[PDB]
A paper describes a structure:
Furthermore, the ATPase domain of AsfvTop2 in the MgAMP-PNP-bound crystal structures coexist in reduced and oxidized forms involving a disulfide bond, which can regulate the AsfvTop2 function. Next we address a new regulatory mechanism unique to AsfvTop2. The crystal structure of AsfvTop2 ATPase domain obtained from a non-reducing condition was solved at 1.14 Å resolution (with density maps in Supplementary Fig. 12). Structural analysis indicates that the structures from reducing and non-reducing conditions are without and with a C72-C138 disulfide bond, respectively. Interestingly, the disulfide bond formation involves a large movement of C72 to reach C138, along with relocation of H73 to pair with D137. Additionally, this significant movement led to partial deformation of helix-α2. The formation of disulfide bond between C72-C138 and the involvement of H73 are supported by mass spectrometry and NMR, respectively. Kinetic assays further indicated that the ATP hydrolysis activity was significantly dampened upon oxidation. Thus, formation of the C72-C138 disulfide bond is most likely a naturally occurring way, in place of mutation, to enable the regulation of the ATPase activity and presumably the topoisomerase function. Importantly, this disulfide bond-mediated regulation of ATPase activity has not been shown in other Top2 enzymes. In line with the redox regulation of AsfvPolX and AsfvAP, formation of the disulfide bond by the cysteine pair (C72-C138) of AsfvTop2 can lower the activity of the topoisomerase, thus also save the ATP consumption and slow down DNA replication and cell growth, all of which may favor survival of the virus in under oxidative stress.
Residue numbers in the entry:
A (entry chain A), B (entry chain A): 3 to 36, 40 to 332, 346 to 401
């Protein structure tokens, strides 16, 4: 009756890794539709499926970030979705094409670094992460979840001297030996076909499933375009995602509900390292048409739905609004994008970040001009 | 640079398993203080520490529940907290005192079932859980997290014929061989000393840390008292937790803010199995003094902060309120306690449950008398 599972079988059965493994109601689910307009998707979807995509996307946005290591130059992240096949490719240095001595002993066969990265659970370059490292990745798990939910997958990486191609098939059951050839290219690509039918979807995807998933991925790519460094262009199905600022994100999310609106902007800064290395970009819209407070937070490349950084903004605005009114956040839509050192995620899904609220009180300052303009707009509505 | 971790080392370093491993701001943190009054704890605390306690408590509440197995009779759950030492004991059948053949081969030594339960990750009786099983436990992880965050721990279990005592020390590094003796007792006890200092606390606990943690545990025990079956009494430091109904919970949470209030009650039922086996108990208070909607949900023994069961209640009330007003949830405090089959938790912490919203629409009915009285109270406030 007491059973012992391995990681691979556990991940196919257990919602704890990536969320539910069939379709459920995902409150707040959005996608982008073509001007770009973010719109709700009021149909049930599988959280673990969307997480396949997210794990690959955050791995790509992580790559340009140095954590006490040599700088890496990434000029593109290319995301593709067609005929059910999903791929994500970025340049910058490839995953090292070299034998991993420890994994080879554990496996009793030659195992190269990219196979460790994609096939070994609890394995990666962030196992001993510094508290100030602002990569989203931390557990050495996410890429393996993508593989375990794929009927077939191909990892291709090149390092400027060699290219490494490896098939990882049947939900990680069948790892084929890699093919290594000479090459002058340099990139990392993951291409896969999710187990759609096992996750509740039609085989092949229905028209509506395809449209919803494409819209979700496109919006995730647009979020990345605002987060990544100035040198990186994001593409979705070869089209550049032209949402490189928090203002552009705010406009896309409010185009239906409050077109031609004022966008209040702020760069929230800190004086002391490590916080001073990481300004937070903010854009907000205030409208009486908004039914409840909403934020979109892209923190360390992750779409965060809950965290004390939001509360810091809301409480600071509220204090001012109460004062000005006496002479409060339900009319606000706010976008917050940037890196925060020292946060801890509450699960592999990275839905919620955890931190002492006093980090923001001690270290960060919200510009008075933004607070004053937000307060004026909110009070006008209240009155 | 690419490192491979084992589960034990990963759990000591990674917030994904139990939450942050030092003190952070936990919005909504509450404890009970002595009449019983639930009050906020406005000090940062370590989520993983509180999760040690929760994992043991949910294991105890799970024990009486049959999932297509023989019925188990549990008459008590005794929780203790003194001098930093935490223990949880329940009766009912003990963990089997028998050699585990598979674990013994993996370990190359004699390993008994209770050592598998407490020391092997991804191991337990719920690995192949039926979708209709309403135990909180699912992953085969929680007890190991308790051990990995203990400087010392003792597992004691008895099966009516033998007693098994095993020391599990130094954050799972040092598993001592068990001592097995004849016995007529029958129970399962876990006693441990958390690694307080490593988790941010004083050694020994400060007066305030001790008071906060005791209050948190006591409130968690009171929540259990409303969830468990009629035959089980919950004790905290030997005192019975006299909060056996949702009404008693609602009163304790509103005693400071709205004493002597009306408590609206409902039992939400479904007609079809498996849902019809699991009525949901509800108690709500409506007051203009409440600043925002709040719920306390004990679902499958777990304190759930987010789930579509709440949304089902809010939307049903809102529809009525809009209609009656025209001739809405911020004045509500609501307690919901019961089992829901087919939910999936989003992480090991079980903060959020996932389900299709249509489960409630199709299967469950909220009594009209409760909806009507709630609506009258809410509309009176609006007007
Ligand atoms: N697109 C990529 N480009 C370059 N290196 C990559 C890429 N994707 C993954 N890697 C490497 O492969 C490792 C394993 O990835 P992954 O399993 O996602 O773990 P992680 O990103 O470190 N942590 P997490 O995603 O929180 O589980 C990473 O640590 C990187 O070193
Ligand atoms: N108090 C207890 N009384 C009896 N059996 C217990 C008790 N605690 C744990 N067990 C058994 O030990 C197993 C391992 O517990 P645990 O590691 O918490 O896993 P789980 O409860 O099945 N799943 P999860 O808590 O979601 O990780 C359980 O499946 C039970 O069979
Ligand atoms: Mg990753
Ligand atoms: Mg458990």
């Amino acid at each position: 009756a007491f059973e012992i599972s391995d990681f691979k079988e556990h991940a196919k059965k257990k919602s704890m890794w990536a969320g539910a493994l069939n379709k459920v109601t995902i409150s707040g689910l959005m996608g982008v539709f073509t001007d770009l307009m973010a719109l709700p998707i009021h149909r049930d979807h599988c959280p673990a499926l969307l997480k396949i995509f997210d794990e690959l996307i955050v791995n790509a946005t992580d790559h340009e970030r140095a954590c006490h290591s040599k700088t890496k130059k990434v000029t593109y992240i290319k995301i593709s979705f067609d005929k059910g096949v999903f791929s994500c490719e970025n340049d910058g240095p490839g995953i090292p094409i070299a034998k991993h001595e420890q994994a080879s002993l554990i496996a009793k066969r030659d195992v190269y670094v990219p196979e460790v990265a994609s096939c070994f659970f609890l394995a990666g370059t962030n196992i001993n992460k510094a508290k100030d490292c602002i990569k989203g990745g931390t557990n050495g798990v996410g890429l393996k979840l993508a593989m375990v939910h794929s009927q077939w997958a191909i990892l291709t990486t090149a390092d400027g001297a060699q290219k490494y191609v490896q098939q990882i098939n049947q939900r990680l059951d069948i790892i084929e030996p890699p093919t290594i050839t000479p090459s002058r290219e340099m990139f990392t690509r993951i291409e896969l076909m999710p187990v759609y039918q096992e996750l509740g979807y039609a085989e092949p995807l229905s028209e509506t499933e395809q449209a919803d998933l494409s819209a979700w991925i496109y919006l995730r790519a647009c979020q990345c375009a605002a987060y990544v460094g100035k040198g990186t262009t994001i593409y979705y199905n070869d089209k550049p995602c032209r949402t490189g600022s928090v203002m552009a994100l705010a406009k896309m999310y409010t185009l239906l509900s409050a077109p031609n609106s004022t966008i209040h902007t702020a760069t929230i800064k800190a004086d002391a390292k490590p916080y001073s290395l990481h300004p937070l970009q903010v854009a907000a819209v205030v409208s009486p048409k908004f039914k409840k407070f909403e934020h979109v937070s892209i923190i360390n490349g992750v779409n965060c739905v809950k965290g004390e950084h939001v509360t810091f903004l809301k409480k600071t605005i509220n204090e001012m609004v109460i004062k000005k009114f006496q002479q409060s956040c339900s009319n606000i839509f706010v976008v917050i994008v940037g890196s925060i050192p020292g946060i801890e995620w509450t699960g592999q899904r990275k839905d919620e970040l955890s931190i002492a609220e006093n980090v923001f009180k001690t270290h960060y300052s919200i510009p008075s001009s933004f607070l004053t303009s937000m307060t004026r707009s909110i009070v006008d509505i209240l009155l």
